[PDB]
């Protein structure tokens, strides 16, 4: 069965069709890279609301809420992207938060050499998570582990306690629901440092483009880059 803790995490998940329709409208309302900056900016709004909605997170005071989000926003962006490929993804395509399916080689061209490399690394993680049978229960657990980081507080006791209970619930779930997949718990946690390295490289690239004058007006994205 599913631990009750994970059932509460699943309740915080955004309504996927409504998020798609909303970001779709925003983009329909400029380089392709510039359009993706807009798409990421809108995704960050959805991420902030997700955490704001969230059990546990909504108990922290604003100052603590800001630190956690400033520390993991890009990691959550990449993790969300990766899981989106795991579920809705196909070979040689990229699925966007707007619901669009684009050919990888086309969007990789538009992304340039550097970004294509990071996108390709992420696709490697997609393939590994698929072979591990990564599912939605495990996904929401990783999202909260990324959000409630210990490497970041007025209430470190809450953060530490959330981290320990989510870890225990994820171990219980993977052991009980994928017992033939040996060490699935550890194999999932291994990907968090990998995703974080990708997100650090992504931030440095976007920060470079911003200083270079290539990132159009996106106040939330830019503010998080300056955090």
């Amino acid at each position: 069965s599913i631990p009750h803790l994970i059932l509460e995490l699943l309740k915080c998940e955004p309504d996927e069709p409504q998020v798609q329709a909303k970001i779709m409208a925003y983009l329909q309302q400029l380089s392709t890279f510039g359009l993706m900056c807009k798409m990421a900016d809108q995704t960050l709004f959805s991420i902030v609301e997700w955490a704001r909605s969230s059990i546990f997170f909504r108990e922290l005071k604003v100052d603590d809420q800001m630190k956690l989000l400033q520390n993991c926003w890009s990691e959550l962006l990449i993790l969300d992207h990766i899981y989106r490929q795991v579920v809705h993804g196909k070979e040689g395509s990229i699925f966007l938060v707007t619901g669009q399916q684009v050919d990888y080689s086309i969007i990789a061209s538009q992304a340039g050499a550097t970004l294509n490399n990071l996108m390709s690394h992420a696709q490697e993680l997609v393939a590994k998570l698929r072979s591990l049978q990564f599912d939605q229960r495990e996904f929401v657990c990783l999202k909260f582990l990324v959000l409630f980081s210990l490497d970041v507080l007025e209430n470190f006791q809450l953060v530490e306690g959330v981290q320990e209970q989510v870890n225990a619930a994820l171990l219980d779930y993977t052991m009980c629901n994928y017992p033939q997949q040996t060490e699935k718990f550890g194999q999932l946690l291994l990907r968090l440092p990998e995703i974080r390295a990708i997100s650090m490289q992504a931030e440095e690239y976007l920060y470079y483009k911003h200083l270079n004058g290539d990132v159009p007006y996106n106040n939330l994205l830019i503010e998080m880059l300056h955090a």
Partner: peptide, 9 residues
Amino acid sequence: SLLKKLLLA
């Protein structure tokens, strides 16, 4: 801060 504005709403 826009982020702080979002969290205070």
